[PDB]
Curated annotation (Swiss-Prot), chain A:
The keyword Cytoplasm does not apply. Residues 1-16 are annotated as: Required for binding of the 5S rRNA/L5/L18 complex to the 23S rRNA. SUPFAM superfamilies: Translational machinery components. This is Large ribosomal subunit protein uL18. GO terms for biological process: cytoplasmic translation. This is one of the proteins that mediates the attachment of the 5S rRNA subcomplex onto the large ribosomal subunit where it forms part of the central protuberance. Binds stably to 5S rRNA; increases binding abilities of L5 in a cooperative fashion; both proteins together confer 23S rRNA binding. The 5S rRNA and some of its associated proteins might help stabilize positioning of ribosome-bound tRNAs. It comes from the Bacteria. It comes from Escherichia coli (strain K12). The basic N-terminus is not necessary for binding to 5S rRNA. It is however required for cooperative binding of L5 and L18 to 5S rRNA as well as for binding of the 5S rRNA/L5/L18 complex to the 23S rRNA.
Swiss-Prot record, chain B:
It holds the Pfam family Ribosomal_L5. This is Large ribosomal subunit protein uL5. PROSITE patterns: RIBOSOMAL_L5. Keywords: Acetylation, Ribonucleoprotein, Ribosomal protein, RNA-binding, rRNA-binding, tRNA-binding. This is one of the proteins that bind and probably mediate the attachment of the 5S RNA into the large ribosomal subunit, where it forms part of the central protuberance. Its 5S rRNA binding is significantly enhanced in the presence of L18. The keyword Lipoprotein does not apply. Belongs to the universal ribosomal protein uL5 family.
UniProtKB/Swiss-Prot annotation, chain C:
This is Large ribosomal subunit protein uL16. Belongs to the universal ribosomal protein uL16 family. Part of the 50S ribosomal subunit. Cross-links to the A and P site tRNAs. Interacts with assembly factor DarP(YjgA). The gene is rplP. The modification (3R)-3-hydroxyarginine is found at residue 81. It comes from Escherichia coli (strain K12). GO terms for biological process: cytoplasmic translation; ribosomal large subunit assembly.
From Swiss-Prot, chain D:
The keyword tRNA processing does not apply. Keywords: Ribonucleoprotein, Ribosomal protein, RNA-binding, rRNA-binding, tRNA-binding. One of its GO terms (molecular function) is ribosome binding. One of its GO terms (biological process) is ribosomal large subunit assembly. PROSITE patterns: RIBOSOMAL_L27 (PS00831). GO terms for cellular component: cytoplasm; cytosolic large ribosomal subunit. This is Large ribosomal subunit protein bL27. Belongs to the bacterial ribosomal protein bL27 family. It comes from the Bacteria. InterPro entries: Ribosomal_bL27, Ribosomal_bL27_CS. It comes from Escherichia coli (strain K12).
Amino acid sequence: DKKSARIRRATRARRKLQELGATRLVVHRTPRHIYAQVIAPNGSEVLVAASTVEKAIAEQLKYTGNKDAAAAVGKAVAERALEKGIKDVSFDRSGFQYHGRVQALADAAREAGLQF
Amino acid sequence: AKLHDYYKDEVVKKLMTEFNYNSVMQVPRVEKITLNMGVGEAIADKKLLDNAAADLAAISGQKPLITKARKSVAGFKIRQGYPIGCKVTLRGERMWEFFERLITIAVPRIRDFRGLSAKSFDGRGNYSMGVREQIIFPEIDYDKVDRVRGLDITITTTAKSDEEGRALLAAFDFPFR
Amino acid sequence: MLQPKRTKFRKMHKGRNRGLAQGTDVSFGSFGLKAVGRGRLTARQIEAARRAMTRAVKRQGKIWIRVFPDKPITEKPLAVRMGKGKGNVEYWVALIQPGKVLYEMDGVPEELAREAFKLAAAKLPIKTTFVTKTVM
Amino acid sequence: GSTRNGRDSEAKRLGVKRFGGESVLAGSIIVRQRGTKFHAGANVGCGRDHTLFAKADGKVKFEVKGPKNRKFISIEAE
Amino acid sequence: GIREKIKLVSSAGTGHFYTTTKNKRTKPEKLELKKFDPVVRQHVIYKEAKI
RNA sequence: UGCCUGGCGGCCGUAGCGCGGUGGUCCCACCUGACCCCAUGCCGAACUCAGAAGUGAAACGCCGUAGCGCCGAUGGUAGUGUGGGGUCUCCCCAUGCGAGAGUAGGGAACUGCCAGGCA
RNA sequence: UAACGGAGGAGCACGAAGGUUGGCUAAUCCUGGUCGGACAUCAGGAGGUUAGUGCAAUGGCAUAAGCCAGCUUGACUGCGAGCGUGACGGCGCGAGCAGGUGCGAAAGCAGGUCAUAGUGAUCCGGUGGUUCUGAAUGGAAGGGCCAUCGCUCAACGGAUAAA
RNA sequence: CUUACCAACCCGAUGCAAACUGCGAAUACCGGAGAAUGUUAUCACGGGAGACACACGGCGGGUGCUAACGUCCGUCGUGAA
RNA sequence: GCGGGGUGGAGCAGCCUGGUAGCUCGUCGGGCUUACAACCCGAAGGCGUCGGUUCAAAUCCGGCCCCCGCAACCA
RNA sequence: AAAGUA
Ligand SMILES: [K+]
Ligand SMILES: [K+]
Ligand SMILES: [K+]
Ligand SMILES: [K+]
Ligand SMILES: [K+]
Ligand SMILES: [K+]
Ligand SMILES: [K+]
Ligand SMILES: [Mg+2]
Ligand SMILES: [Mg+2]
Ligand SMILES: [Mg+2]
Ligand SMILES: [Mg+2]
Ligand SMILES: [Mg+2]
Ligand SMILES: [Mg+2]
Ligand SMILES: [Mg+2]
Ligand SMILES: [Mg+2]
Ligand SMILES: [Mg+2]
Ligand SMILES: [Mg+2]
Ligand SMILES: [Mg+2]
Ligand SMILES: [Mg+2]
Ligand SMILES: [Mg+2]
Ligand SMILES: [Mg+2]
Ligand SMILES: [Mg+2]
Ligand SMILES: [Mg+2]
Ligand SMILES: [Mg+2]
Ligand SMILES: [Mg+2]
Ligand SMILES: [Mg+2]
Ligand SMILES: [Mg+2]
Ligand SMILES: [Mg+2]
Ligand SMILES: [Mg+2]
Ligand SMILES: [Mg+2]
Ligand SMILES: [Mg+2]
Ligand SMILES: [Mg+2]
Ligand SMILES: [Mg+2]
Ligand SMILES: [Mg+2]
């Protein structure tokens, strides 16, 4: 099963981040959409979030499942984070390769101000 | 790609009627075709494998993958990790073109051919057949062989039972007996 | 003579023999010979009692042996001093606690089972008693 | 005759060194073990021989956590 | 004990050396690694030599 | 506010299997292509990218159902600390602690944060 | 925690079998398949670690510590809060600090290897280094200090170089 | 076709284990808190030693034959004194 | 008790250290001879007994059996 | 040079 294979791929880095007490930037990617969440160190409270299933973000995009949508979510989640004064996070690729859409989201969040 | 069009424009409705599937994604598909050469003679002369792969490359138009022994076996004098085979996995367009070259050219050139068995199904709708001589494939010049070679052919199908797998292969006129 | 076909280890600590038995019901036949005392049953004893039992019922019915001699017993040979390692395995025993059903019988009348079990008990080093199957 | 046995190795003094609720300084060994019978929790490290040691001052705490019902040792800051 | 001791000599000309072992029958090629030379306080190339 | 879905957690079988049913606006999945970024010790299978015609078939979610797993008393029994006793290889008495197994029974999880769809 | 109690192993291996990043998941059986057989390679299914671990056994291991690949030398140098274990000599675990390094986009990880055997005090000397010493003085010899080498001293806390 | 037949696997039922464990005590041990009691009974450093042949009895065991006023450990008691 | 053994019909190599095992004689067929022997040609024929380890054992390991050689002592 | 027997 594809989802269980990815969850296995993601566990080692997630357990490391929990041990370090880091604030996580979690990314989730589907064929049609991409999602970003900034999660508190306890792992059970979401501080900010942005995705292509939101109207205000998806209205400005031709298609929600490409690198351009990824860059828009990356920038959006960073501005909302800095507005709450968060700044310092750790990137959690959630078992996806650091590449393509996932990388384009990360690059946009770095550019917009998030330190990782 | 011709046989692929044959599948989508005529085989689906034939099977949609014969088995009364409600969804079209229920229709059996041809997932992949895998060719295998068990070259157990390479442990004495590794160059024998280099020719067997050369044939499989010509027959399929794809670089073959040398396969290794999963464990040491005393009965065949092989240690774990010995290269003793070669295989090729065909999917998509290259699959269908080989599927066409096989039914309409290579199979009618079989020694004393009298139809393929219809009991060579594994129980979950996949078909396996053995070719005794590699000369049946026109990409093999009968004059440049150094040794006659067979192979196995497996057609892996997304069917659920043996009856649906034979129905799918029949719709392409698989030369059964 | 019963004896394990193979074992993990050749020799075994002496141990002790406290407690009451497990397996105190007639479970396979209708009549049983139950241990009242505590002790060891050698393989020769188990077999001597089996023979006496079996000849008394004229090899009719069925007989179960509920105990198996799985404990090896070592002995030091004569004129050997103390030390120099554990002795050699000489025979096999089963440890018996009070309540242990040792044999069971079926397919014969109760009067004959009583007589056959009496002849067998005379071969055994432990006090025994005749029991019958109970519904609960 | 003689025996073919008679050998043994020195005892290794493994086991729990600081029990639940004990106050420890950073660096203190909590348990010595072969392999991870106990796993490292918060503020606890796992050495190369799988020794669990305190990474901060505080109180030892044992707990069972996770999907495998594994035993974890952590240090509660005091 | 077939493995033999060898020394890895700094290429920085300081005379500093590390020591290790080597199976000279299976790997006769000279061992070469970049290691920290504490005399010049840099990582440099170190080359196998006799013990 | 209620319903449905996605993500991250708590918890770690009363929560897992099996069997039966059921869902596609959205979401999810399969899916459609691949010159490309990237990829196959062969294969666009997987990873990846560009997409949105089709289908909920598989998967997943939800609902149902004790065929299982799992949980589980009360009482008794085993063991045992202290003191005393006997016929002392083993037990008994006073007092304190008191299982395991089994029985009745329970049981088709519960829950926090954020987001989207619908009413 | 003893016995001339019950059972097995060591006196190594490895410049990758070490570091790191990314990926992966076992045994066994059943069915179908050229030569091909009980057992080779192929395909599907059941199964769920019954495999695997450089070598005994135990404790571990899926976030794998098991399998594959890319790049590499942290198998770094100086130190070390604190702790374990020893009569002692000693032996072990260790965050963190300075310098310099590898892998990773990054958080990070790396001071050898899943861990626990693979060993030998002191003396006497050998080799290289050295801002130390240098018997009137300048040198030198010799000595010190740092790195390293020589023992089945195995009766393994090692009476002698030699029974 | 047939078995004097043998039957592995799986299913059901019954036992056994120092080097078996999907369960699991009593005690013992480590740590914290509190009262009462006890001539500090605790720890550290320093002056002086003796001792390093133990014995039997109870309980838990290895060995021996659940032999020994036997032998070897653990723990308590007394003898030693 | 410590050693060493056990392999074609006989006597004996190989074992050590894992990957089908030899030699002499004997036997069988043919030839030479009036016939036999001698001689010549050609062929055939097998790891004491289990267990274990191992992908694989004549071989390594641990039992058991049969043989051999030393030792089984001081009062 | 080597040729035994009935
Ligand atoms: K199929
Ligand atoms: K359930
Ligand atoms: K490596
Ligand atoms: K590597
Ligand atoms: K002078
Ligand atoms: K000595
Ligand atoms: K005692
Ligand atoms: Mg006991
Ligand atoms: Mg030990
Ligand atoms: Mg796809
Ligand atoms: Mg469905
Ligand atoms: Mg209970
Ligand atoms: Mg259910
Ligand atoms: Mg003591
Ligand atoms: Mg002692
Ligand atoms: Mg990794
Ligand atoms: Mg590794
Ligand atoms: Mg390793
Ligand atoms: Mg190791
Ligand atoms: Mg001298
Ligand atoms: Mg000098
Ligand atoms: Mg001078
Ligand atoms: Mg000594
Ligand atoms: Mg206390
Ligand atoms: Mg003494
Ligand atoms: Mg003494
Ligand atoms: Mg004593
Ligand atoms: Mg006693
Ligand atoms: Mg005793
Ligand atoms: Mg005595
Ligand atoms: Mg006694
Ligand atoms: Mg005295
Ligand atoms: Mg004569
Ligand atoms: Mg004559």
